[PDB]
């Protein structure tokens, strides 16, 4: 049935697909000073389509900021902010992105869409790999 | 006639449907402290299409929250919050959901659509069933 | 001519039609305490299509409310609130409804569309009829 | 040419027309108390399509009001409120209507569209005609 | 190429055009009291399509105002308000219009679209021409 | 694959293309008075489609302003304001423009779309070239 199967998997047959370095939330504990540190599973490659979102600059406290966004369609269960849970994280083009929204569709269909925000430059390995 | 019959019943012929554990309001009484306890009748299975709603995280009291939503099309009379009546409740993927909107269409057509919010993880039975 | 004739009358030829118990405003007088009491004509059956309106719960004074809406297409002159005139009332599925908006179209075409709110449960006759 | 000619005149060949009693602004002087009195030309009949506008009731000062609207397409120069000018007035179904908006299109094409609000019941002549 | 050439010039082949008396900003100097007087080039005829904009009346300081708008598509470079530069001015149907917005498209394509606001009645020449 | 390749490159085959003088940010230092001074790479010609954006005049501090916008589709990595990075700048028709939004699409497809504001008149070279 169409709401079953995997629509994004079939759609990946024709359109191209980028490879991101996904990384899943594991457990998250408090360091000193009540700032609260997150930890994650092992990274793994993910086949996803990362379309753009129009990012517009704004002004706050007389400074200029801009929130960088990407909308990722991926064939995986992607979970953002949740009670007792922090967001997920994926690397793309040497930039960290964490999910902000959650389009779900997983348990219905197996795929998902999420709006993710850039966080900062990725750490560079000794060999030149753009991963932590 | 087309406003009669059951359009969702015919639409279920082609598209797939999920099975949720629906549970209907019975009557509701006040415990101590004037907090007010709602109780229900026996659960029963329901064939419904549970599509997604874009859930976006927000900020309140310097904390970060996110309201989880699913839009359920079901071939049953579904009643949310009402004068002297509490909301209805269904179980899906081990998550409790309570209805928030009401698309009606029941007395006209026999089916309905409701926006429902996740409440929390379901209780796990001794045998492993994801029901209360 | 098409803006003449009656488009809803011919549209009723193919689609189904619900029977509501319409009731027209006659006069209203002030009882004690300066509140007005409304009186009405004799009830009469009306052939109309009563589609849904998305009703969403809200919060006021820390309580939870929800306004129940139905959009009625009927082949009759329907008038809601007016200067020196109170709104009309129709019964459907043992629920009272009063008109809130007014699509008019009567003097042009003969039919009309109105948004109507639920008021409460109908009075039950001794024989079980759901009419006042 | 199409922006020339008269598109509403051609459109009136197929769709029907309602006859309204139009009345054009002539001059206006102030009576006593600095309230200001409007005067008008002779009434004349006008063929126009008077479609509806969804009129929704509202609340002000704990009372309930509702502004009645009609959108009139007429093959005439219709002028509402203006500097040193008051709006025009047309009678339809024994009700006065004053123009509120102005769709212009006259000097381009010869016709116009205006949003008009009901003012009150028309005066009834001795013979029963519903004009002032 | 299509963004080159002149799309409005070709579009004028089929649709009709109105003739407006355009007039271009020259240089602008201050009279006494620091009110600041603008003056213009010689008027010249312009072939343009002057479509309507829905003008709606509003209330300010308990008075009633209404802003008269026309959207002019003309095959000429049209500049409204600018740093050190005043808006441009065209005459149509004996009414002065000053440009409000600026649809540009000139250096791309040669034509432009501007929203223009009525200023007032035109000066009448001795021979009856509706120009300054 | 279609999200690969370069859609704007082939789209330039049929539609026309303007030539702008692009200029990329290099570094930025604080001069005296703690204001930063931007400096850039060497200018280079860029092939892009610079469509209009509806620019409307507004009022601030009882003066009248207007922000001039252009939407540039270019087959290059274009970066506006960023943490520790100033926006890029391109010259077109003797006017300086700096990017404001960022449509991205580069690493996906190779092209991009940006909203750019006008800054002021270009510096005129001794030979008459409209470049810095």
UniProtKB/TrEMBL annotation, chains A, B, C, D, E, F:
Organism: Pseudomonas virus Pa193
UniProt cross-references to Pfam families, sorted A to Z: E217_gp28
UniProt-recorded name of the protein: Virion protein
InterPro entries recorded: Gp28-like (IPR054441)
């Amino acid at each position: 049935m169409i709401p079953g199967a995997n629509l994004l998997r079939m759609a990946f047959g024709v359109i191209g697909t980028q490879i991101v370095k996904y990384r899943k939330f594991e457990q998250r504990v408090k360091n000193d000073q009540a700032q609260y540190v997150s930890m994650f599973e092992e990274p793994f490659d993910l086949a996803a389509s990362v379309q753009r979102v129009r990012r517009d600059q704004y002004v706050q406290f007389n400074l200029e900021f801009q929130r960088n966004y990407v909308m990722i369609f991926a064939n995986f269960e992607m979970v953002d902010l949740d009670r007792d849970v922090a967001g997920d994280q994926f690397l793309w083009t040497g930039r960290v992105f964490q999910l902000e929204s959650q389009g779900s569709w997983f348990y219905q269909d197996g795929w998902g869409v999420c709006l993710a925000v850039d966080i900062g430059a990725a750490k560079l390995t000794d060999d030149g790999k753009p991963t932590f």
